[PDB]
Amino acid sequence: KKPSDYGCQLHYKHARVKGTLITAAELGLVDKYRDLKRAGQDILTCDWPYHYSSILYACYGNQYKILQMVEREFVGSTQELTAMHTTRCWVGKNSAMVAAYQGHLETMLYIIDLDMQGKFTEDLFKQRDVMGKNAMMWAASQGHTDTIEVLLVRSLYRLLPEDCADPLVLKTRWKLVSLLADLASHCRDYDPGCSRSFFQEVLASIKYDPVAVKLKDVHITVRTLQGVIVSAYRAGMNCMGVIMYCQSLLQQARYFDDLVAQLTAWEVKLLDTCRNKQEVQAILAPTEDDPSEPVGYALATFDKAFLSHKFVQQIFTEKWDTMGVTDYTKSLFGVVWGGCSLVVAFAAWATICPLVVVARSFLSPVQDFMMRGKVIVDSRFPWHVPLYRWLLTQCALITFTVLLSYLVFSFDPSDPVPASVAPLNTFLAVWCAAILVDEVQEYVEEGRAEYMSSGWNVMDVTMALSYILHYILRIIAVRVTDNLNILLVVNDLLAAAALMAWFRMVSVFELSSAIGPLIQMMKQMLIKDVTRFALLVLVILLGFSVGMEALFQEACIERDPTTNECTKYTSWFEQKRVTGVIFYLIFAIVTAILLLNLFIAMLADTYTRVSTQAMVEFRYRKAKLMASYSRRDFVCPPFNLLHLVCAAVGNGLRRLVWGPDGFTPVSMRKNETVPLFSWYFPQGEEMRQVVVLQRRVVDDFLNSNRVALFREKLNAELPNLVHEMLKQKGKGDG
Amino acid sequence: GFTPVSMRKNETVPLFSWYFPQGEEMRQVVVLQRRVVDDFLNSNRVALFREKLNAELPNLVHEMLKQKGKG
């Protein structure tokens, strides 16, 4: 009969009812692949436009069967098998990418089982391709959520050490591998005789005898991460670092944002289980035993929740500013006495800083003197205070924009030839040369990630590169060639470089808390909201500009022979034309109102999003800054260039004269032969007191999770416990 | 057979390729939907009751003392 009311609303509406090893690999014929390989022609016959072997079609079309035949039949060694799986595509995919590039659990579980057993020789899941993608980064990009978990369980298993023998680090290795062996549990091998499960040889070599399932039992849940954070700590690892590492595994997966928010809430719960500073720097410190620093990993992976805590902003402040000079602004005595000492000691800086850089490269009693300080760090040895190194940088920054705006307010139409070079116009070309040297050894030494995600390094290139290009193209446009329109490009390169300098000079407000989260906003509603609304307006404005030309074009018909009279009303008795241009320009003004209304509501969205995080972004941009200057030398970019020249000369001398001398002024900023803090690697009987004080903190953290995971085990059965206390009430029994 | 249809929007094929299982896929999907939605329906029975026990919390405590009144 007719269906239900639900019937005709939800039910499905419509009515329904070859010679190569490659095409025997993709279809999955085992024996046809075995016969034709006994004639052969290769085992890596690769087709042309995409560089796929006969292996990478089994990984493509989900045949673990004939990948397993080759591993049984046609292989000699470990080194021969890995040459087959690491045979890249034309994009660069190995065997493990192609099985994670598209959801093929049954092939991915074969490759992982070949990797748990140690039958490889390279980390097959850590290799990259042309785009730098990964096997874990392809499965997260495409979104195959069932091969992401299988890659999560492998990286959680591989964290735990196989060498230690503790009964709770061997239980949770058995309960991660058997989460994968029960995940396959079907899909037997190609031989119909000797049949065995996938993770046979891995659960065997683990030494643990265990003395209608739910989806709480076949997935990684929050009680499964807690079994790893304890067992990594019980086996000996930094518990603050295992939480940061397991977090950045789950941010890579993009589909476990309910577990990322828990692991973040444990690195903020462990971080304020501490009381003193002595307990903060006991769990954040590396030792000889675990050399793992978690502070340096958080500001490498931009960890805004850790890196702006009360206790992390306290261990940076007692190195950046141990004297409180940053609070000599909130008083009248502070501005007068702090300001007057600044213009004195910046006048004293610019006259002695060249004389120290020369007399430190070949005047060795000074280089052993300039290393003194830097553990006391305060006003006794003022060149090591990291706040003061920042103040000299901002003073040598405003000096460039005063000496550049004086270069343009002191131009005249008076003398062409002895004004192309000057004591001022050539001095700034050396200055901008030494900003470009500064950005090279910033880029080379840190890397492309922290360079582009920084303060104003991209902007400080362009104001330096366009002034040099102003300086060169003015020299060779007076003498080499005579004169052209090339002289008017010269006035644009100095107009960019004078604009970008004053907008660079609002980095003196990186530390203000009123003018600080206002510059970071105005950067962000200008590099996001305006460069994506200008692409929309360019399509609209080019449509009205075409439509005006179709509205003013002529059609000239009054002639008896050919082409004699022609009606003129172009701009791009006949009182009809102006009527149409008025109505057309009204439709453009309604369009301009409708887009100025969408631009202002676009920006008020961005104000609401960057100001709900005002004092977390600020305390993160501060601590990326307090860590950058604590490793940086006191030579600002105007004397960056003198330091490279005297150290290239002054260390070439002590290769001819005395040999194993050492202590050279190293030709890099951001010194590497310094742990960031002085409370790092604690040799002696301070190691024994940290390890006691760490184990007090972490053991009191791990049983406030074990309490808070017990209350959630009771929230799940709250309507079952209420029914049992109500019956244990004296209806039945007392 | 297989003549070019002049009608666009091919109506024979379903939307996705995983729509109608035919066999062991049908027996596995039934095991997966019972696994998922029986733990959807449990965690609504608990979460509705918690809002009943919030608003009516001094009446459960009063029933535990009312038994001193009767028995």
Binding site: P719, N720, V722, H723, L726 | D38, L41, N42, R45, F49, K52, E56, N59, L60, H62, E63, K66
Partner: peptide, 29 residues
């Protein structure tokens, strides 16, 4: 339902799946 939700559930849905307290509310005052 009082006998199926007597010890955890015999409706296979952890209880009788439409059964709670309603211990009983009073009037008073």
């Amino acid at each position: 339902e009082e006998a199926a939700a007597a010890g955890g559930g015999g409706s296979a849905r952890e209880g009788a799946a439409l059964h709670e307290p309603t211990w009983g509310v009073d009037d008073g005052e």
